[PDB]
Each structure stands twice: as structure tokens, then as C-alpha cells.
């Protein structure tokens, strides 16, 4: 049986504040700029539509040097940091971005038509953009976040997959890495392996995987380390209703309609797809720049940062403004020429993480050691190399950032005022 | 006279948790894919616009094997499960679908016209799609849900129905089965038997019956077994205003207008129909992923699951995103060709049902046995074959899912915290 950490984790009266200075990220909104011949990334892809997964490193409270150490017995017990307060500061002005594709697979406008559309020739793709669905979310836990998305499932050993055959789906659980993309209105799927077309969605998600937090799975998690607190806010509506060019993969059963004739003799593509639109963004609806007091967790792990680690996942599309900056090739002619100017796109993100940590102690009795050993043997081994080297996240080092004077920091003042004593 | 179950049903102190692992449904959004020459369903129709009716099977508390059995007398009484908490977990990202018809009966745009429209020829149908009305609802009871819809009533034995005569309407009560369609903006009616046209609405409801819960009838129900708790949330607005091609079934009385001339000599179709649109979808408006505490029922049956059965009806169109996946017939040519790619459509639904059940006992006195006998004779007969074999629902077996450790589950923790003791 699993038990609340409140059972075996003792709470001291010591609190420390820790915060990143001010994280900054600048890059191209849709794709990374690199040397054609090369593969080294010159400019990275930075979009408001990517997940930001911060791997927070905390100083080992056992190796740490406290002014007083009488508060615990280093022989019978050990120390762990407990996250009690978080403030995800965001810094750019609110605004909405926009993504498209020069060759988006969009046949005709099916929202309203005055006459039957012509006939699909070869490549009827259009240059089209859209404002993605709005999403604000924040996940906190001592284990990285887990997402779900539809990918191409493995086929059954029978009927040989005829070329062009529809690929099988499979919900795939994955680890959400820093830089991954969020569902933008086309659901959470792997567009690379499910769309040979390469033109069904805008460039920025076009050959990526849009993942959605698997909240269900994470909360079911027995120990609940992956996430002990979260805030989600997503909204979306249909801006336009389109058709997909291409060829019928699956025909419309004729028992569903009466054959036409002349123009209506041939059925138009009924492979409709809508254009998303996350409406207006607003201050009143902000999730960030507000402190989160992680006092009672719904999981058994009540904010204990086992391994002196801490994960903070964030997605904020309420500051997705992309800025176009163009340089002139010549500063002479007083006559505009498109060609005299090179147009570019850049997007900036501004973060500022702040935390309040509470020191905790664990008396290593038999039972406790058995439990903690079963739960996560590494805990004890590390007490008296990176297991997630495969994954990549925004590394954040706070080992030199802890301060006992909450007083001197904004999140600190807030915490004191909130907790009174 | 009917009486509250609180009268004859005794509440023990035992509580169990039970939950589905994670139900998953994948299919085509508008119609089932099957073998032409055949009739077996190769891929089912799975849409966010269908009702999901779960037939929950519970282990017989009488046959069940409890660690302690002193809490009751198996001679004078019997045991029944009472539903006290439900959590309908939903798992895909929020999003809106879209449905249309390649040959929708839409003459002209009547929202605004600059000149009198031409003249209906033969087949003026257009390839049109729309975003259905938004609907979120959850019905719970120990009897299947009941819906209403307009169908073709039986004609009076007199005036021989002239071909093309308008068919008579009749409100028809039916049992809502898993897979049935929800009103989408065109009301709750049987389009198959009321629209020979086969082109009045999108393919997905085109030859189906859109049913609406008959809340009034169900709550009027004397014992109130069909539904002892519900949540409904529906919204819709007019996106477009159209005209219907076809021939005047009923003419416009000439006392309602002044005859035209020339172009306005011939009256245009005044058989208008609007295009629905369930606006934006939002987190803040979610109904699911929240626990429902069924403590005080408005009906006489206060959540008693007679027959060790339990019905959970759901409709959620806030995750109706359909995803188009296309496979290339050839991976050679570096030039797009619509003929080289087969376009398809698929939609996925993700559920996770969780419940908290309270054990109950009934001392089988004379009066009690007379009452329960009148109410539903099968109760007693089953105590010391399926009556709804005709109907089909998502069968859910929980006989091996009960656990006394609410502590170990998210809904269980929530319940304890909520009920304190």
C-alpha cells in the first residue's frame, strides 16, 4: 500500500527562497535556422506553442551547509526539500501569434458555396495561416511530465498493407520534453508518421508531434511524483471550414445519398477539416504571475522533491506574438522595392521562476527504508549519472540560489504574509 | 405510494472504489467503414456527437466475499450497492469537430442578397460543412436512459396520402443506446423517415436519429430509477441562413404578400434553414474530470443500484477533433500530386470511469417484500437472461474492480477528504 508523505516525512520550520534570475529565449517561431550543408543549429525554434519543461536542480540538503544543524540527527535521519510555493513569472506583453503553410492542403471553402466547386487538378494547395488554440498550463512534480498523442500503430500480421492504405492508430505515452509542441487545434498526434502529405498543418507542427498531458495517467500514478499540482486552461473555436485535396481513401457509402449528375455527378471531397482559433487573450484570465501554494496535494507525494529535483512544465500561448524584422540590402534608393528588403521572423519568450522550499527530515527506520526502497531505491543509494540523459529539458541550477531571507524576495514576502507565522 | 429508498434501505459503513482502466474508442467520424460486398464492420463510426451509454456491471454484494460478514444477517436481509460518487474522466485535448455533406440541399444564401437568385434547375446541392451545436451531459441511474425525437406518425384512415404529401409527426420515446446521435442543431428527429431527400443534413446524422434526453418523463418516473442525477450543458447559435431546393410542399398564402413581376414574379423558396454553430469550447466550462457526489437524490431512488447494475450516459462534444491522416501511394516523385495521396478521417475518444460505492442492507420484511416486489419483482427473484438484450450499450464489467482501499485511488482520496470521516 502507498501512503502520504505526511506519514514518514517530517516538516521542519526552515524555509528557503530560490529563483532563476530571468530566463530568456529567442529564436524563429516555425523552424530552426541552420547551415544548409551543415546541421549545427544557428538559430533555434522558439514558439509560444512549445512546452517548456524545466529540470530544477536543488542543492542536496544533506551536503548543504546550514548555520545550525541541531534541528536533526544526521545519524538516524536524512533531509529532503519540499516545494511549498511557486511563482511562474512571465514577461512579455500579452498577444497572439499565428502559423501557416505556403502549401497547405486546402481544396475549397466548404463553409458556404454558391456553385459546385471545380475539380481537383494537380496540387491545389494554398498559402494559409491561422491563430492556434489558446492554452495555458502548469505542471509541477518531482518526475518529468507524461503526455499522450496518436501515432502509427503496428500493423496486424495478415492483410498486406496496400500502399496508400490508411495507417493504424495507437495512443502513445511519451515523456514531455522541453521544446515539444502542444496540440494547436488539430489534436495530439504525430503528423510526420501520420501525414505523408507534409502539408496538412502549418510548418511549426508540420513535422512534429503535438502532445497532450496525460492527466488521467499521471494522477492514477500510485506515488504521484510526476505531478502534485497543475493548472490548465484551454479554449478553441472553428474559424473556417475547409476541404482536403487528395484522393478518396475511403469512399462515402452510397446508402447515405442520392447520386447526382452533370456537375454533382462526381462527389466533392467530404474530408473536411476546420481552422482553429483561440479567441481573445486577457489579463483577467492569466494563470501566471500569481503564486501557487502547494499545501495539500491530491496525490500521496505532497510536494516532496525526491532526488533534490523538481519539474515545472509550462505552456503559455497568451504571449505568442511573433515580430517581423526586416533589414535593407541597400540604404540608397528612395523607392520601395520588395527586393531591397530581406524579411525575417523572430519570437521571444521571458520567464522567471521563483520557489519557496521547506526543509524536511526522514528518520530512516526499518519500515521507512523498506518503503522508500521499494518506491525508488535510488533515494537511499544517493543518500549517505543522469537516468534521463536521453531526454532534454531546460536545465535550471538553483544550488547557489537558496536564501533564508524570504523577506528579501517578492515570492518570499507573499509567502510570509500568506502563512502569517 | 412510492417512498424514498432511505426508508427501507440501510446504509453500512463499508465503501468500495471501482474504476475502468481507460476506455478507448477509435473509428471514422461520419460512417462505418465496411466491406462493400460484405456487411461486417471493418472500422466503426466513432464521433464526439454520439451518446455513450455505459452498462456498468457490479459484483453481487450477496455473492461477494467480504473479509467480515458480521455487519448483517444473511437470513433476514439482503445486500445492494449504492452509488455515492462518480468521476467521468475524459482524456483527449479540447477541440471542435466538423461535419458536412457533399450534396447538401442548400439552394442560395438568404442571409443577404444583392439581386434575386436565379432559378432552381436540377440538383443545386452544394458540398457544405458546419460545426455542430455544443453539448455536454451526463445521466446516471440504475435503468437505461430515455430519449425523445420526432418521427413519422401513423396516418389517419381517410384522405389517401398523395405521394409527396407532408408526413405526420409524432413524438417518440425510445431507449437511448450507445452510439446514438445527439441533436446537432437540427433538433431531435428521425431524418431517415422524415427526409427522403437524404441531403438535408451532414452525413453523420443523415440517415440516423438524433435523440434528446426526455428529462421531463424520466424525472416524472415514480420510482426514479432511470436517472437519479444529471448534468446538462448545451449552447448554439446561427452561423448561416440558407434556402432549401426542392418543390413547394405548402404554398405561401397570398394574403401575406404582394405579387411580384419579371424576376420577382416567381416566389423563391421560403423553406429556410439555418446552419448551427456551437461556439468556443473551454476548460472553465468543463463538466467532466470533476467528482459528482450523489448524496441527496431528487427522486425516490437515492442512488441504489438495483440488479447490481448502473447506467452512465455521456455526451461530450468539447473533444470532437477529427484528425485527417493521409498515406502516399508512392514515395518517389518530389512533386505533389493529389492522386498520389489517399486522404482519410479518424476520431478518437478517451474515457475513464471511477466510482465510490456504499454497501447497503435490506431487512426483507413482509411490507418491504411487497413493495420491492411491486416495484420490480426481478429484484427478489434474483436475490437468494438479459431483459434488454435488444438494446446495445458499452458493456463495462467491474466485478473484479472493487477495492476497499479508497486511499489508493484518486477518486477515493477525494471522497475521503470530502466526507471527512
Amino acid at each position, epitope marked *: 500500500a502507498v501512503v502520504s508523505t505526511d506519514e514518514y516525512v517530517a516538516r521542519t520550520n526552515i524555509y528557503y527562497h530560490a529563483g532563476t534570475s530571468r530566463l530568456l529565449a529567442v529564436g524563429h517561431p516555425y523552424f530552426p535556422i541552420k547551415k544548409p550543408n551543415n546541421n549545427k543549429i544557428l538559430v533555434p525554434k522558439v514558439s509560444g506553442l512549445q512546452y517548456r519543461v524545466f529540470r530544477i536542480h536543488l542543492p542536496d540538503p544533506n551536503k548543504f551547509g546550514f548555520p545550525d544543524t541541531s534541528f536533526y540527527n544526521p545519524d538516524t535521519q536524512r533531509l529532503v526539500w519540499a516545494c511549498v510555493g511557486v511563482e511562474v513569472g512571465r514577461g512579455q506583453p500579452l498577444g497572439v501569434g499565428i502559423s501557416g503553410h505556403p502549401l497547405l492542403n486546402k481544396l475549397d471553402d466548404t463553409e458556404n458555396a454558391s456553385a459546385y466547386a471545380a*475539380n481537383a*487538378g494537380v496540387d491545389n494547395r494554398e498559402c494559409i495561416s491561422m491563430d492556434y488554440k489558446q492554452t495555458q498550463l502548469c505542471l509541477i512534480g518531482c518526475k518529468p511530465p507524461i503526455g499522450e498523442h496518436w501515432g502509427k500503430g503496428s500493423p496486424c500480421t495478415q492483410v498486406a498493407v496496400q500502399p496508400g492504405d490508411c495507417p493504424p492508430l495507437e495512443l502513445i505515452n511519451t515523456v514531455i520534453q522541453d521544446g515539444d509542441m502542444v496540440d494547436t487545434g488539430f489534436g495530439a498526434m504525430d503528423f510526420t508518421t501520420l501525414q505523408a502529405n507534409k502539408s496538412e498543418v502549418p510548418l511549426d507542427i508540420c513535422t512534429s508531434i503535438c502532445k497532450y498531458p496525460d492527466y488521467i495517467k499521471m494522477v492514477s500514478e500510485p506515488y504521484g511524483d510526476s505531478l502534485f499540482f497543475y493548472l490548465r486552461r484551454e479554449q478553441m473555436f472553428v474559424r473556417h471550414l475547409f476541404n482536403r485535396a487528395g484522393t478518396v481513401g475511403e469512399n462515402v457509402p452510397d446508402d447515405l445519398y442520392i447520386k447526382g*449528375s*452533370g*456537375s454533382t*455527378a462526381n462527389l*466533392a471531397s467530404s474530408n473536411y477539416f476546420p481552422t482553429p482559433s483561440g479567441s481573445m487573450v486577457t489579463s483577467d484570465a492569466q494563470i501566471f504571475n500569481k503564486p501557487y501554494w502547494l499545501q495539500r496535494a491530491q496525490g500521496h507525494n505532497n510536494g516532496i522533491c525526491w532526488g533534490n529535483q523538481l519539474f515545472v512544465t509550462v505552456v503559455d500561448t497568451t504571449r505568442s506574438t511573433n515580430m517581423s524584422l526586416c533589414a535593407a540590402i541597400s540604404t540608397s534608393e528612395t523607392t520601395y522595392k520588395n527586393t531591397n528588403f530581406k524579411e525575417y521572423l523572430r519570437h521571444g519568450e521571458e520567464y522567471d521562476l521563483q520557489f519557496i522550499f521547506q526543509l524536511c527530515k526522514i528518520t530512516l527506520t526499518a519500515d521507512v527504508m523498506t518503503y522508500i526502497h521499494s518506491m525508488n531505491s535510488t533515494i537511499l543509494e544517493d543518500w549517505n549519472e543522469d537516468p534521463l540523459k536521453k531526454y532534454t529539458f531546460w536545465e535550471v541550477n538553483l544550488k547557489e540560489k537558496f536564501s533564508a531571507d524570504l523577506d528579501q524576495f517578492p515570492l518570499g514576502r507573499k509567502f510570509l504574509l500568506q502563512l502569517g507565522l | 405510494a412510492v417512498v424514498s429508498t432511505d426508508e427501507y434501505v440501510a446504509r453500512t459503513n463499508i465503501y468500495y472504489h471501482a474504476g475502468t482502466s481507460r476506455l478507448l474508442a477509435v473509428g471514422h467520424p461520419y460512417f462505418p467503414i465496411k466491406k462493400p460486398n460484405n456487411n461486417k464492420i471493418l472500422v466503426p463510426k466513432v464521433s464526439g456527437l454520439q451518446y455513450r451509454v455505459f452498462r456498468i456491471h457490479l459484483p453481487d454484494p450477496n455473492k461477494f466475499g467480504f473479509p467480515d460478514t458480521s455487519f448483517y444477517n444473511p437470513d433476514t436481509q439482503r445486500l445492494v450497492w449504492a452509488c455515492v460518487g462518480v468521476e467521468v474522466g475524459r482524456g483527449q485535448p479540447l477541440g471542435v469537430g466538423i461535419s458536412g455533406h457533399p450534396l447538401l440541399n442548400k439552394l442560395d444564401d438568404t442571409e443577404n442578397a444583392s439581386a434575386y437568385a436565379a432559378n432552381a434547375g436540377v440538383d443545386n446541392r452544394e458540398c457544405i460543412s458546419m460545426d455542430y451545436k455544443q453539448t455536454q451531459l451526463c445521466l446516471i441511474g440504475c435503468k437505461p436512459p430515455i430519449g425523445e425525437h420526432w418521427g413519422k406518425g401513423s396516418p389517419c384512415t381517410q384522405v389517401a396520402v398523395q405521394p409527396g404529401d407532408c408526413p405526420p409527426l409524432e413524438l417518440i420515446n425510445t431507449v437511448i443506446q450507445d452510439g446514438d446521435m445527439v441533436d446537432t442543431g437540427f433538433g431531435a428527429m428521425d431524418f431517415t423517415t422524415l427526409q427522403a431527400n437524404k441531403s438535408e443534413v451532414p452525413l453523420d446524422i443523415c440517415t440516423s436519429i438524433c435523440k434528446y434526453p426526455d428529462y421531463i418523463k424520466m424525472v416524472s418516473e415514480p420510482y426514479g430509477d432511470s436517472l437519479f442525477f444529471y448534468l446538462r450543458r448545451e449552447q448554439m447559435f446561427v452561423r448561416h441562413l440558407f434556402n432549401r431546393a426542392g418543390t413547394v410542399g405548402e404554398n405561401v398564402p397570398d394574403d401575406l404578400y404582394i405579387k411580384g413581376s419579371g424576376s420577382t414574379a416567381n416566389l423563391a423558396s421560403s423553406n429556410y434553414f439555418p446552419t448551427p454553430s456551437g461556439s468556443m469550447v473551454t476548460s472553465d466550462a468543463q463538466i467532466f474530470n470533476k467528482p459528482y457526489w450523489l448524496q441527496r437524490a431528487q427522486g425516490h431512488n437515492n442512488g441504489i443500484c438495483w440488479g447490481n447494475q448502473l447506467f452512465v450516459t455521456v455526451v461530450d462534444t468539447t473533444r470532437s477533433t477529427n484528425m485527417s491522416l493521409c498515406a502516399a*501511394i508512392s514515395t518517389s516523385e518530389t512533386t505533389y500530386k493529389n*492522386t498520389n495521396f489517399k486522404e482519410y478521417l479518424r476520431h478518437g475518444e478517451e474515457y475513464d470511469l471511477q466510482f465510490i460505492f456504499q454497501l447497503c442492507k435490506i431487512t426483507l420484511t413482509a411490507d418491504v417484500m411487497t413493495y420491492i416486489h411491486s416495484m420490480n419483482s426481478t429484484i427478489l427473484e434474483d436475490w437468494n437472461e438479459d431483459p434488454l438484450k435488444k438494446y446495445t450499450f458499452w458493456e463495462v464489467n467491474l466485478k473484479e474492480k472493487f477495492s476497499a482501499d479508497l486511499d489508493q485511488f484518486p477518486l477515493g482520496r477525494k471522497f475521503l477528504l470530502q466526507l471527512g470521516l
Partner: antibody
Amino acid sequence: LQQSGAELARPGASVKLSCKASGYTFISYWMQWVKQRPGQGLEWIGAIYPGDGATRYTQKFKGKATLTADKSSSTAYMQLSSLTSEDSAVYYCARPSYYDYDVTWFAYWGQGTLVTVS
Amino acid sequence: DIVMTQTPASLSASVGETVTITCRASENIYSYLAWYQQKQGKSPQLLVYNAETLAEGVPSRFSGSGSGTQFSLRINSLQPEDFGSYYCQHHYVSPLTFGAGTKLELKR
């Protein structure tokens, strides 16, 4: 669309005609079957969509012609039964280019198979 | 079934001459008409589809016209390679049916 040159059949029997597709994505198109007797014009028999087996038949040939396909070999087949002298004719398979309702042409025809009932 | 009436059954003409072959439907077929040429001893080849659109490799001297029930195929300034048989066929719905055919022969 390679078709065998000729078939000799006995009266009352059946005949299986083949059509081998090559040079294109077979599963993306229907297959047309057309009859030609020297005296008369062209007559449509039916058409099939190999991707799911959907067929359409001339009422005249319902109960006479069966259409099928072998997606692994890209071959379309037509079978006729109860053959009489009236079935002796040249049978062609052909394709139907369909891209949209306004772009389509059944323009490529096989060489035909001369079926002689004798 | 839908009937396509094609006329004339036979037509003589000289090189350089403009001729017209017509096809009339028993009921409305909209714009979904096709035309084919069949030379002596050869398989048919499609010239026109959707009543008026030129097919792959068809000289612009050919032109289809019409919509509803009356259609025509006109050949401007006949060339030697244009003599042979022509057939109309609707491709609106099944069953697909053909016109009777026109044999275009060279005057001498």
C-alpha cells in the same frame, strides 16, 4: 493495362479475364470493363474499386458478370458464365482517371481479349 | 436506362472541312458527357470529358459543347488522322451508356 490476346471457351462454361495494371498507383482508381462486338458499338459491363470491392453493374450484365481484383498483383478480373455465341466479343479493361468532379477522364484502355465461344 | 442518341450514324468529309457530331440524352446528365475516337482496329481513346474539356494530347481543333441533354463535338479543319469512329458516353451516374457511334469517312 495488359490483357491476354484471346480465350477459347466452350458454350455454357465460364471465362476469367485478367487485366494487369502497371505504371500507376492501382488502388487509387476504379476499373472499367467494356464489351465490343463487330456489329454494334461499345457496351459498358461494370466497374470496380479495388480499394474496397465496390462494384457497379449494367443491369444487362447483373447475373452475368462478376468483378473482382487482386491488390497484391495489381490485377483486375472479370468472370462471365453460361457463355453463348452472343458473348463472343472483344473485352477491354480501362481506366478511369478521377481527381475531382470536374477532372476525370477514362482515357487509357488495355489491348482487349478476344473471347470466342465455340 | 438513360439513352444517348448520337447522330449522324455516318458522315463524309474532306480534309480542311469542319464537321459536327451531336449527342442527345434521354434525360438531364448536366455537364458529365465524354467523347471517344476509335480508329480501325484500335481501342477507343478519350478526347473530351465534362462535355467540353480537352483530354491529354487532343489537338485544339476539337471542341465539345453542351450541357443538359444536347451536346456536340466539333472538329475544325479536319486532318487525315481524324477519320474513324466517334462515340459519346455520359459519365454522370451508373449505368454508363454510349451513343450509337458516328463513322467519319473521307470523301474522294
